[PDB]
Design a protein around this ligand. Structure first.
Ligand SMILES: CCCCCCC/C=C\CCCCCC(=O)OC[C@@H](O)CO
Ligand SMILES: CCCCCCC/C=C\CCCCCC(=O)OC[C@@H](O)CO
Ligand SMILES: CCCCCCC/C=C\CCCCCC(=O)OC[C@@H](O)CO
Lengths: 93, 99, 118
């Protein structure tokens, strides 16, 4: 369901990066950026998995852990966007 | 959320934020600017993940357990490695621009 | 004061964690060796600054995810129960992030060295 859509997303990114006439270095940066997002999203899901296992009811530290994990994912997404934007502006510069 | 109003996250937050601003103004090529950003961004990501770990641990209980201390130590280790990676990154790249 | 004591304390925790992870597992020790070799090779390698960083950044990320996944397992094992679905799920997601980080590093080294022909 959700993991499939992310799998579709990252596959398209690889296809696009392969479709673009770019060098080895820039191609690595494009891929690795999206790869990092995958890593953070998986680790964040691991956090939420532990949280939902520990607590049966609501707790402050439980919501804190989820917010911090979701924040890390956001920072990762932003980092990927900035990376793609900078490189593409350079290639078509 | 309520995480933003903390002395620890303000200091770590501005340290990374300043580096991004500086890197955005530095006169270097694209791939260099990307690495300057991605390095300090990675540090922030690891710090947020590490902070999430500690939050989960404290959620468990106040009574100490060996795995509880191990979880925090391993988390701090990842943060350390991330900072080292950031320093080395900026050191190698800026050494050319600095001369 | 507070800023200096946090750096020292975090350095103490980090070194205590790196020590514990090195003592407990043999696979971790060999992994650290593989990383250290990669760092030295990339430093002595005749490539430009950007490639040198990428080779380093790859293996450094591997260790970070490894330590973070090991932190997850520590919390999971901390929890006391016979068996839970989210117990295996948490480690499954963590192990997935580890294998992704390793593969991405291997491919990076593969592509970069193949383009350098060295
Ligand atoms: C127009 C908004 C697109 C979506 C957001 C993309 C943000 C990208 C970059 C933010 C500024 C940081 C880097 C900008 C800069 O200093 O130079 C970039 C340029 O040298 C690349 O060739
Ligand atoms: C440029 C290298 C950055 C770090 C790469 C990853 C290194 C990971 C682990 C290195 C060893 C961790 C600390 C273990 C150690 O040195 O001593 C353990 C010893 O006291 C008992 O066996
Ligand atoms: C080519 C490698 C150069 C050094 C790169 C970083 C290596 C990191 C750790 C290796 C040194 C730590 C080994 C253990 C050690 O010396 O400490 C002994 C321990 O009693 C201190 O608490």
């Amino acid at each position: 369901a959700a993991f499939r859509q992310e799998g579709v997303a990252v596959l398209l990114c690889v296809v696009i990066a392969a479709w673009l006439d770019v060098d080895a270095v820039t191609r690595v940066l494009l891929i690795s950026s999206v790869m990092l997002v995958m890593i953070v999203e998986l680790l964040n899901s691991a956090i939420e998995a532990v949280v939902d296992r520990i607590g049966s009811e609501y707790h402050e530290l439980s919501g804190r852990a989820k917010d911090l994990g979701s924040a890390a994912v956001l920072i990762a997404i932003i980092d990927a966007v900035i990376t793609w934007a900078i490189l593409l502006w350079s290639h078509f510069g």
